[PDB]
Design a protein around this ligand. Structure first.
Ligand SMILES: [Mg+2]
Ligand SMILES: [Mg+2]
Ligand SMILES: [Mg+2]
Ligand SMILES: [Mg+2]
Ligand SMILES: [Mg+2]
Ligand SMILES: [Mg+2]
Ligand SMILES: [Mg+2]
Ligand SMILES: [Mg+2]
Ligand SMILES: [Mg+2]
Ligand SMILES: [Mg+2]
Ligand SMILES: [Mg+2]
Ligand SMILES: [Mg+2]
Ligand SMILES: [Mg+2]
Ligand SMILES: [Mg+2]
Ligand SMILES: [Mg+2]
Ligand SMILES: [Mg+2]
Ligand SMILES: [Mg+2]
Ligand SMILES: [Mg+2]
Ligand SMILES: [Mg+2]
Ligand SMILES: [Mg+2]
Ligand SMILES: [Mg+2]
Ligand SMILES: [Mg+2]
Ligand SMILES: [Mg+2]
Ligand SMILES: [Mg+2]
Ligand SMILES: [Mg+2]
Ligand SMILES: [Mg+2]
Ligand SMILES: [Mg+2]
Ligand SMILES: [Mg+2]
Ligand SMILES: [Mg+2]
Ligand SMILES: [Mg+2]
Ligand SMILES: [Mg+2]
Ligand SMILES: [Mg+2]
Ligand SMILES: [Mg+2]
Ligand SMILES: [Mg+2]
Ligand SMILES: [Mg+2]
Ligand SMILES: [Mg+2]
Ligand SMILES: [Mg+2]
Ligand SMILES: [Mg+2]
Ligand SMILES: [Mg+2]
Ligand SMILES: [Zn+2]
Lengths: 81, 129, 87, 155, 144, 150
RNA sequence: AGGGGAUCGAAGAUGAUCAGAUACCGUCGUAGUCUUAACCAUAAACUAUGCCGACUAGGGAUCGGGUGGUGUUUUUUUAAUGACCCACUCGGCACCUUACGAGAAAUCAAAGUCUUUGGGUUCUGGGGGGAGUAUGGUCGCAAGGCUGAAACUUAAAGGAAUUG
RNA sequence: GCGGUAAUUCCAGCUCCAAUAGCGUAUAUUAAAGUUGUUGCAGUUAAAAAGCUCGUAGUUGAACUUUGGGCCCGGUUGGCCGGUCGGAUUUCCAACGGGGCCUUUCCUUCUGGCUAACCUUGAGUCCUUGUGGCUCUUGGCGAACCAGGACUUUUACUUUGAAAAAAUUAGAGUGUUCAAAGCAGGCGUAUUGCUCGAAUAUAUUAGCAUGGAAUAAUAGAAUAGGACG
RNA sequence: GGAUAGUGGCCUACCAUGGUUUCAACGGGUAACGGGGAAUAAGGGUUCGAUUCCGGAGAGGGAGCCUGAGAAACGGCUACCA
């Protein structure tokens, strides 16, 4: 306070902030590759779903929507990229 | 809604100074803001500033010192008729020795002394002392 | 503040807050000048020799006296760590 | 404005002193006269190709353009062969150091060598008193229509 | 910015508002309503000459107790009747009824003097000759 | 902030700096553009497409992988509706409201709402109308709107 | 204009009180209070404080939304849930302490960033009374609403704080 | 505000003040008045935020599109010398401005007339060991503008300039004895005439004419009815 | 077309339905001739201009006209009104 680096602020205190108030703004949602070992291939999903995403071939489910992040369905897995 | 983008940038600088700070993060920057920041810097009243590039419209960090009392904007960009510039600096500069009125002419965004030397005129932007 | 032919006219050129380069005017009796003593090889504080700093009353009232001392002394070489330019 | 008929009056319309000898067998029936009004105003081809008569035409008639040359945007085309344009402008009040929007409507004769519609910007030229109010004659359309055919139906 | 439009073209509005609010100025309003010419016993002019109807004895306002000696004057250009005060000790002995006095204002811009209720005027001359004179004795009142 | 109320809610997509990429994103322009048009074909709105192509597939932003907004991809492949969907959904709303004010005259609060809705319509109309996307003399009316939206 | 009319209850009538007592207090109780259809458009309709945007400073609560956790409590077999706890973040209703700053003060995170006087815009005021009166227009079934003067009078009226 | 019995205020005497051939008074207007507020007002409680929202006119309205760098030309002040018989210009130097080039860069455009300018060079050289210097025709600059054709997105701002009555005003020169004025006057051979004047400025809003291209608008290519040939 | 010195709804015929307006039309008031200018002096302003120069209008009020290069003249005529 009174004198500080607005240009190179600490990752942490930048981390806690709102997504619109970071130095350059950017998103905080991610994408994932989700499995349900009945199948062999892996459908990519947005961290925030709205649409209750259905798998490639089987009308199974995958995730349900929420206020924000999707609820992934029981016996599943994921990586993030 | 956001009206003179210049205005906010100036006012922000002034509350940093008054609060005794050394830095401002202004938003959203502009051709004009830079060229106004650019004049002050040229004459001491602030340090080094920096454009940061959000892919939007821009932010600027200004580093300032404390040589600065006030940097205001004249909110209707009035027209000034090369005679009338005398009467401006008179109304709003602390004395005849220092401080600048900066305006905008066809020949560029310049303080009034450069305006006087270049001998052109135009619209009035703001001022620094 | 000279004059026609050289000649330093107008008395008294005021001090200056070493933290905000604003003037430290006279009636400001809330301002402060801290003398930090130069030391030598093995303790020994060398009387009458200081690294000094002056801070406006404004700054002290705002509480910004400590953190500002921190930064000034350290980047003048008498503190290592303590301060951080990032936040 | 005109359109159609041409010989539509009680008197016979004709350019004055432009005799066509019936004896001499011609391939154009009517010998026509025109000029170039000057000041670099193209006498458009519709005034040469034309058959209309309009004596108050700057290219085919016995007016003459001299004096003020003005521009304005068309605001009324309800009068036969004459329009009304609005010349807008800002007027400066010294005490406040600010201007206010003002405007004026100038009535002006428009030769059937032009096809004007509301909204067209039009360069008019001062001429002699041509009627009670009209002291100007349309002399070039610096417009077109303002992208009307780019308002057609659906895909 | 409170109120006033700061635009560069907002001249018109800015003008109009002024016209509007000049009316809240007492004098401007008086000037244009022609209040002077319209109401007001004098023409609007500096003095007016009229004729004496009755000599009056107006009781002063508190906290003063007095009898103030005045004249009802019927202005000549007007017929308007007006009560005027007759300055300085005696002087009411210089007037008499049907005589022709010359009235002036009281220097309060309309508005009666001190403790004289209603009197908005004073006598300056009777029978063409000036009170002041008659008082000092520099001059004598005319024949008839 | 907030046109027809006193709301002040900051809330928006924070779009990425990454104006191209993802790089972990395979597929192709080809791939997504077809993917858009079949959903156009199903009758979906570009928004619904973006949302659908967002989660179920990888389409971070349609315009990225294909330098074109979704509504322009539609227009070109000849799918674009008569009127913009925001105008549409405004009208669809004002109908539903209106239907309700009919069946419930006593509901002064609804009357109020309908005004608001329409006053957004009517200003939005005048924008589109100005910029020629709507034919100069297009007009919203009660009597004819319930035909319009469906 | 219908319906309804329990209750409380302008008007009225009373018992008392009083020098008087057209009242306060007690009783009786008409309209009304409730509802439908249509009017009326006013309240100290109050935060006596226009709206949009930027900036300026600390604190613990809380309401809604979300994110993070080898947090608690729920047992079953761990979970899943749900409620709870802690940190953070938007956006609410407020309180707290400060006051760089503002104010005639009382007080004010706006009433701040104003003689170092300009972000955009709307509206109202210009001593007091006369007076929200007269008049004309207009709206209304009416009661009244909106618009709304002058002559004349007048040296104060007024505000916040102080001591009595 | 004084005056109801010792009136600092009335009626006078004395004395004293202010302005003075002039001084009071009445009315009006102007300054004071930031109490009409563009500059520059005030509205919680002193006068003043419409009960509330919508909303036309009106005023207003985010950011972004040739920037940066390199080269040449010649000006006007100022320094350190002055060479010179108070002012002079060359080289040294800074400083502040103007113009024109090349950087991927319309300058409206063809069709000649015109050329002032160097990529030239044709000779060589006044002279400091030579790019210090200009005369100088035979291959090779466009724009500096004539004039004819063929065409041109609209504006605001600002610069300089024309066209412009006098008296008034600001202001130069001149000792109307001074001055307000006036535009006179001043010199000698005062016997036969000599001569300086009768400036300058302001003159704006509009129209005109020109330079500028920041600021703020306008128009352009999306059903291609696009642009160049 | 007529009329004029001549353009022109200037007037007449025929035909049409236009013209102006919250950017304030139209109407009302002016104890209103306009201008150069005058008064007040930080600046921005405020107020004034019947009146020595320029323009316009009039000759008690209206209209008409003769002469003439030029008047709708008034120290010209004609009529009505006062
Ligand atoms: Mg017609
Ligand atoms: Mg009032
Ligand atoms: Mg009487
Ligand atoms: Mg009379
Ligand atoms: Mg917001
Ligand atoms: Mg709104
Ligand atoms: Mg949202
Ligand atoms: Mg009942
Ligand atoms: Mg009773
Ligand atoms: Mg009783
Ligand atoms: Mg009673
Ligand atoms: Mg009220
Ligand atoms: Mg309250
Ligand atoms: Mg806080
Ligand atoms: Mg009193
Ligand atoms: Mg005595
Ligand atoms: Mg005595
Ligand atoms: Mg005495
Ligand atoms: Mg005097
Ligand atoms: Mg100003
Ligand atoms: Mg005030
Ligand atoms: Mg009040
Ligand atoms: Mg309110
Ligand atoms: Mg802009
Ligand atoms: Mg000029
Ligand atoms: Mg002169
Ligand atoms: Mg005709
Ligand atoms: Mg009609
Ligand atoms: Mg008006
Ligand atoms: Mg008159
Ligand atoms: Mg005059
Ligand atoms: Mg006048
Ligand atoms: Mg007169
Ligand atoms: Mg005459
Ligand atoms: Mg007479
Ligand atoms: Mg008559
Ligand atoms: Mg006559
Ligand atoms: Mg005579
Ligand atoms: Mg005569
Ligand atoms: Zn599956």
């Amino acid at each position: 306070v009174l004198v500080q680096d607005l240009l190179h602020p600490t990752a942490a205190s930048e981390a806690r902030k709102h997504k619109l108030k970071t130095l350059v703004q950017g998103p905080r949602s991610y994408f994932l590759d989700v499995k349900c070992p009945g199948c062999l291939n892996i459908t990519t999903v947005f961290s925030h779903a709205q649409t209750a995403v259905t798998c490639e071939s089987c009308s199974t489910i995958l995730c349900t929507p929420t206020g924000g992040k999707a609820k992934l369905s029981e016996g599943t897995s994921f990586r993030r990229k | 809604t956001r009206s003179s983008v210049l205005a906010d940038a100036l006012n922000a600088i002034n509350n940093a100074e008054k609060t005794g700070k050394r830095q401002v993060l202004i938003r959203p920057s502009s051709k004009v803001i830079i060229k106004f920041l650019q004049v002050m810097q040229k004459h001491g009243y602030i340090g080094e500033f920096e454009y940061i590039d959000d892919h939007r419209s821009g932010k600027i960090v200004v580093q300032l010192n404390g040589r600065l009392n006030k940097c205001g904007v004249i909110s209707p960009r009035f027209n000034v008729k090369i005679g009338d510039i005398e009467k401006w600096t008179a109304n709003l500069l602390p004395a005849r020795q220092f401080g600048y009125v900066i305006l905008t002419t066809s020949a560029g965004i310049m303080d009034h002394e450069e305006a006087r030397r270049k001998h052109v005129s135009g619209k009035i932007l703001g001022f620094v002392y | 503040m000279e004059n026609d032919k050289g000649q330093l006219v107008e008395l008294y050129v005021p001090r200056k807050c070493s933290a905000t380069n604003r003037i430290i005017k006279a009636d400001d009796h809330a301002s402060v000048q801290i003398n930090v003593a130069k030391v030598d090889e093995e303790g020994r504080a060398i009387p009458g020799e200081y690294v000094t700093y002056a801070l406006s009353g404004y700054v002290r009232s705002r509480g910004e006296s400590d953190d500002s001392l921190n930064r000034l002394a350290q980047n003048d070489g008498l503190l290592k760590n303590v301060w951080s330019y990032s936040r | 404005s005109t359109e159609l008929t041409v010989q539509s009056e009680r008197a016979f319309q004709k350019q004055p002193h432009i005799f066509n000898n019936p004896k001499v067998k011609t391939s154009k029936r009517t010998k026509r006269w025109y000029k170039n009004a000057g000041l670099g105003f193209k006498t458009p081809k519709t005034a040469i190709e034309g058959s209309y008569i309009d004596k108050k035409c700057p290219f085919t008639g016995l007016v003459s353009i001299r004096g003020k040359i003005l521009t304005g945007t068309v605001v009324s085309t309800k009068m036969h062969r004459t329009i009304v344009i609005r010349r807008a402008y800002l007027h400066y009040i010294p005490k406040y150091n600010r201007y206010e929007k003002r405007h004026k409507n100038v009535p002006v004769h428009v030769s059937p060598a032009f096809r004007v519609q509301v909204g067209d910007i039009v360069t008019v030229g001062q001429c002699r008193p041509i009627s009670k109010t009209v002291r100007f004659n349309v002399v070039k359309v610096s417009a077109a229509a303002a992208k009307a055919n780019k308002q057609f139906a659906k895909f | 910015g409170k109120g006033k439009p700061r635009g560069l073209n907002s001249a018109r509005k800015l003008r109009v508002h002024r016209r509007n609010n000049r009316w809240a100025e007492n004098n401007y309003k008086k000037r244009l309503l022609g209040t002077a010419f319209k109401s007001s016993p004098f023409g609007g002019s500096s003095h007016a000459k009229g004729i004496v109807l009755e000599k009056l004895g107006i009781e002063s306002k508190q906290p003063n107790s007095a009898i103030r000696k005045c004249v009802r004057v019927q202005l000549i250009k007007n017929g308007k009747k007006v009560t005027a005060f007759v300055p300085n000790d005696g002087c009411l002995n210089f007037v008499d009824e049907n005589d022709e006095v010359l009235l002036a204002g009281f220097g309060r811009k309309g508005k009666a003097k001190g403790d004289i209720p209603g009197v908005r005027f004073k006598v300056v001359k009777v029978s063409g000759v000036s009170l002041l004179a008659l008082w000092k004795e520099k001059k004598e009142k005319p024949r008839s | 902030g907030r046109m027809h109320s006193a709301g002040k809610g900051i809330s928006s997509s924070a779009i990425p700096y990454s104006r191209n990429a993802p790089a972990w994103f395979k597929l192709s322009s080809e791939s997504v553009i077809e993917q858009i048009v079949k959903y156009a074909r199903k009758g979906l709105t570009p928004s619904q497409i973006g949302v659908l192509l967002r989660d179920a597939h990888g389409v971070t932003q349609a315009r990225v992988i294909t330098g074109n907004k979704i509504m322009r991809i539609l227009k070109s492949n000849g799918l674009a509706p008569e009127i913009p969907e925001d105008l549409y959904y405004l009208i669809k709303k004002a109908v539903s409201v209106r239907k309700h004010l009919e069946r419930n005259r006593k509901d002064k609060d609804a009357k109020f709402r309908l005004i608001l809705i329409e006053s957004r319509i009517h200003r939005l109309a005048r924008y589109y109308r100005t910029v020629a996307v709507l034919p100069p003399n297009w007009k919203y009316e009660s009597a004819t709107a319930s035909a319009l939206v469906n």
